[PDB]
Symmetry: C3
Subunit: 286 residues, 3 copies
């Protein structure tokens, strides 16, 4: 029934979340995934892990085969996808070492395959217009947040708490990402424009991954690791992965493993059926 | 002599604006148009209709061959293009069931062929930089608005009328569209950003259609149908019936607009359309 | 030593010869003119080719930058025509840019990736201040040396703005083209606080940094885009008429800037340019 896929970003190229049971070199109608998929169990919950950028981190954000990654996880029976992403902060209260359970995004990517459906031969037949107002699976979002609570990691909810309750390092219970195409980081001019728009963090990999997960009928939630402030305060590759970030990986692993258990502890029949019905009801050719 | 092409969007996949005299199954130097073009008359005015998404609505917005559609209409001697588009509202006074005769846009599309000219072997030779300050044919916009008046539909001009003149359903006498690439709808984050920029509606099909019409020397005007509020604002059977009624009204507007176009001389406007292309050829002026 | 490449846009020394080169990323826009400014080697490359037949979205920026790198250039000075989005930047002015916002798409914007037509690797370049500051200041000093007014918004104000002037800083929005902006887009860009709009700065500036080169751009204001009156709305004739009046000033600045670069030592700067590339490899 429930099976949890995990897409590991920067810092999660060889996650070792569970003892490896099987290794799947698979293909999809949309090509090869970033790497082999590793299947196993967390407790009694089947789980599948794949590194977004492949082994050795050779695939840049704009060239990841998001379609193949999501479709391959779905083909293996995944009902959920938990994903990590390293990001820069655009706001004073989002400090390096914090995490963010995202609930919103603004898309500035281009040139990436962002839908399974279309009119050309390398796509599924149909025109699919998915609602994306709240683009994540809210139930799965709350499980990431509860998992943090269960692992004694501070949770800061701006809606029900004051700024004095923002004790770092903390998990931010909501937040918006602007997803840029990369590979370059933002200019200071771009960073201030994103901040003035009210965006919380900037990354390169959330879109179209989040969109395709919903197209596939899967429940998707992302946990973003704040690795540095973006250049409005500067961001470098070495800074995006440092001693704080090495500590961040430890706690993100604990959140992910606890989130998988928490997913497995609940019935998802109605949510899964709703995910599938949202796809069929978004077809405008039918 | 004038000849009006009509590109029908959602709700116009198979319109019967007139008894079809002939059909033209053609291709263009830029590929196949979305469907067979249907030829006929409104009164004594020659007319040509093609559905933007093809019959059966199998072609999504980013895959529509805008170049082929415009070129095919130009090849048949069209002097004008009237186009429809179903859109979401970004503003409180643009209510489902209203219409907008667009006069402005912000472009957020990518990955679409948006010009007939370039340095590639299959493009027309030359560098064409068209002015787009006011990107529609203003004379044809005013015909659409007058057609609405002639068909007893309210017209609301916010530049001269108090918001107490905004009586629904109404044709908004001006408005701006943000054209997103699709196929997904916007997030709430994106919707509120577009709203804060002052954009009136969101759609997926205006650009590059409007640009290519001007490149082709054709007078282009768009009438948008507001089908719903975009997701900045938090049953379906009522919305569907409302859209059906909107299609009936837009069909009335198109039929009257064709007659009004035929009732005037367009020699000078057509010549100015063609001169604007020649004066935008940077390679010739250099 | 130093060697300065010049990438000249719309309508834009002792000439020794013309050279055709190939690159791993294709052919440059045109042949390159090799020569000297005093004792400094200099190479001139027309961005849009002879006859201006290549539109901004189709310029092979990777080839142009790599061609100059392969010839041993340490610096690239670039020009571009642009539209002003702000009252105090008027046609005939110049802007030594220091910032940009990118609205381009569909252009090859990096030398590195996982496809066979790119260099193997994942390169995430910092771009907070995307130009070479030393080279920007040389463009400004060159204008001073040629008796062209310099206007600095951080220390002067509109009352002290003498045209035609070189604006000592400024941000560009780079749009993909080939069409000019709508009024709606122009006002949105202006409300974001951008100074000018153009079509060719990106990915040229990004690829220069990827190649370890010092890059600075001087933009020529040819028009007010289309946020003003209808008689002031941009079109090709308007851009070309003003560009022809401003070329000789751009010439004087660029040629003076080449001499000023050659008068200084760039050893540590060049080292830092190269080291920045190496430290940005994530693979
Ligand atoms: N500042 C930043 N911008 C974009 N992606 C990032 N990933 C980590 N830090 C980032
Ligand atoms: N207004 C403008 N927009 C874009 N590119 C330009 N080049 C010159 N003027 C321009």
């Amino acid at each position: 029934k429930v099976k949890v896929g995990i897409i590991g970003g920067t810092g999660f190229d060889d996650p070792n979340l569970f003892k490896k049971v099987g290794v799947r070199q698979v293909t999809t109608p949309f090509g090869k995934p970033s790497d082999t998929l590793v299947e196993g169990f967390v407790g009694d919950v089947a789980c599948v892990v794949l590194p977004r950028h492949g082994k050795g981190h050779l695939i840049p954000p704009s060239e990841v085969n998001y379609r193949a990654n999501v479709w391959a996880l779905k083909d293996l029976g995944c009902t959920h996808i938990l994903a990590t992403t390293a990001c820069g902060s655009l706001q004073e209260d989002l400090v390096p070492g914090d995490f963010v359970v995202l609930n919103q995004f603004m898309d500035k990517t281009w040139g990436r395959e962002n839908t399974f459906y279309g009119s050309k031969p390398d796509s599924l037949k149909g025109v699919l217009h998915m609602p994306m107002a709240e683009p994540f699976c809210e139930r799965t979002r709350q499980i990431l947040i509860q998992a943090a609570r269960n692992k004694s990691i501070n949770v800061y909810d701006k809606k029900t708490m004051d700024k004095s309750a923002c004790i770092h390092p903390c998990v931010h219970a909501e937040g918006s990402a602007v997803t840029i195409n990369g590979p370059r980081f933002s200019t200071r001019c771009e960073s201030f424009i994103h901040k003035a728009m009210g965006l919380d963090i900037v990354n390169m990999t959330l879109v179209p991954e989040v969109s395709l997960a919903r197209e596939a009928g899967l429940s998707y939630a992302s946990i973003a690791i704040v690795t540095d402030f973006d250049c409005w305060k500067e961001h470098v590759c070495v800074d995006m992965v440092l001693e704080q970030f090495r500590k961040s990986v430890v706690h993100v692993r604990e959140i992910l493993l606890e989130a998988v258990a928490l997913i497995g502890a609940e019935d998802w029949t109605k949510t899964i059926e709703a995910n599938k019905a949202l796809v069929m009801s978004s077809r405008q050719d039918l």
